[PDB]
């Protein structure tokens, strides 16, 4: 599949998606934060290219369900900035990127 990443580093915003019995609470991270997440999610991220993340798993902690849930969450739970702007008719600006611009 294809996973959208914010600056090829982290997810867009926070995710609170539920897979069957697994409650995935994932939140974005600062540059250079590191993967401070459960080992299953850490492996999925390291293979998918995510470098900074933070989250906690609630209710069931079955490894396989966690892996399926996190892949799905990346795929559909999150939404890119461009898609939000287009469907909204508004402009979303990254303050960090525009502060360091020319």
């Amino acid at each position: 599949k294809e996973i959208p990443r914010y600056e090829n580093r982290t997810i867009y915003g926070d995710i609170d998606f539920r897979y069957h019995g697994v409650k995935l609470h994932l939140r974005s991270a600062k540059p250079g934060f590191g993967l401070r997440v459960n080992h299953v999610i850490f492996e999925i991220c390291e293979c998918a290219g995510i470098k900074d993340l933070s989250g906690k798993v609630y209710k069931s902690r079955n490894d396989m369900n966690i892996a399926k849930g996190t892949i799905e969450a990346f795929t559909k739970a999150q939404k890119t900035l461009d898609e939000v702007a287009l469907g909204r008719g508004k402009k979303l600006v990254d303050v960090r990127k525009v502060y360091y611009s020319s």
């Binding site: 540059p31 250079g32 590191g34 993967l35 401070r36 080992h39 850490f42 492996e43 360091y100 020319s102």
Partner: protein, 349 residues
């Protein structure tokens, strides 16, 4: 600190902040750090082993954990947009072991004043260093931007110079040197033609590698072809007779007396001074020469500026992490430091 117990063991293969030949070979054969087929704890453990082996070997883990600072330092370039091209990712987590670089021990080692951080520690504790003109005996002294520190020049020459051979080692080396020189002259005198032609053949292929090219040219032009030419590196038979055999070395009477044994040695490349101990008063190999296996470890840090003319350095700033380059010098790739960083964040939980 921790006692040096099997620092340079081959089986473990750990790389240390040292110029030692065994350490160099371990670095040579390490072939990266294996992290496949390991549970996340095992990967974290291997990373801590390797990083702690290199960075802060002498620091106790409790001290290191207290010193370890979660917040890392990085620099952002405004001119990135001016170039208008793809930018290299910033290696943020290569600055995990950057706190140790303020210490005077690491500062000396990076500045190529001591062969090892342990040697830097001993230099500091023995009163051979001065920070801003104040002599500091404590290795753990932390430095500030714009600071100066100096080391006694003799100590630096000892660190970066070859080991001084003992009396009997030098005497043996001289005896065998005379033995081989006598062979060279005898073979030159017996069949001068073949010796000269092979000497010229060696002269031809030199690849700007040794300084004997200009010596040999001066040798020839000193007495051969002062004004004549050939249509020059020409053969002469006089030098064969001019060569004189050197007297042998008893090695049993000359022992126990350096001045007496030193008057007999008259080698063309070593006159009136035994091998290595030209001036025994100095602690290093006199005349001074770089120590063996110095090339792979000679690195110029960016956070320090060094003047070997006077063994003075300036602490420009703390190491930083620019796009595509990290100022912390380490033989471990970014993932290893990532695993180590996430081990120490939770105290190894």
């Amino acid at each position: 600190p921790r006692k040096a117990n099997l620092l340079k063991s081959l089986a473990r293969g750990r790389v240390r902040t040292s110029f030692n030949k065994y350490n160099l070979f371990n670095l040579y054969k390490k072939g990266g750090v294996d992290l496949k087929s390991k549970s996340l704890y095992q990967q974290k453990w291997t990373a801590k082993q390797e990083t702690r082996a290199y960075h802060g070997e002498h620091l106790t883990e409790k001290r290191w954990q207290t010193v370890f600072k979660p917040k890392l330092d990085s620099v952002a370039q405004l001119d990135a947009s001016l170039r208008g091209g793809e930018i290299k990712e910033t290696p943020f987590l290569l600055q995990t072991f950057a706190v140790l670089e303020k210490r005077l021990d690491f500062a000396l080692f990076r500045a190529m004043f001591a062969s090892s951080v342990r040697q830097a520690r001993q230099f500091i504790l023995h009163g051979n260093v001065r920070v801003n003109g104040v002599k500091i005996k404590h290795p753990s002294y932390t430095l500030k931007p714009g600071d100066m520190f100096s080391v006694k020049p003799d100590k630096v020459l000892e660190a970066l110079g070859a080991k001084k051979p003992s009396f009997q080692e030098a005497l043996k080396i001289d005896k065998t040197q005379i033995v081989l020189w006598n062979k060279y002259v005898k073979e030159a005198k017996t069949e001068p033609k073949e010796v000269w032609e092979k000497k010229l053949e060696n002269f031809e292929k030199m690849s700007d590698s040794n300084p004997k090219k200009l010596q040999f040219q001066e040798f020839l032009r000193q007495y051969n072809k002062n004004l004549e030419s050939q249509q020059s590196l020409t053969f002469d038979p006089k030098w064969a007779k001019n060569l004189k055999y050197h007297d042998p070395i008893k090695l049993s009477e000359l022992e126990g007396d350096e001045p007496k044994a030193r008057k007999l040695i008259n080698l063309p490349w070593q006159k009136n001074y035994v091998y290595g101990r030209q001036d025994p008063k100095k602690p290093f190999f006199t005349p001074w020469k770089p120590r063996p296996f110095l090339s792979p470890f000679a690195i110029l840090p960016h956070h320090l500026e060094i003047s070997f003319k006077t063994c003075h350095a300036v602490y420009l700033r703390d190491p930083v992490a620019r796009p595509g380059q990290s100022e912390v010098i380490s033989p471990f790739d970014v993932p290893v430091h990532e695993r180590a960083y996430m081990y120490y964040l939770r105290n190894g939980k």
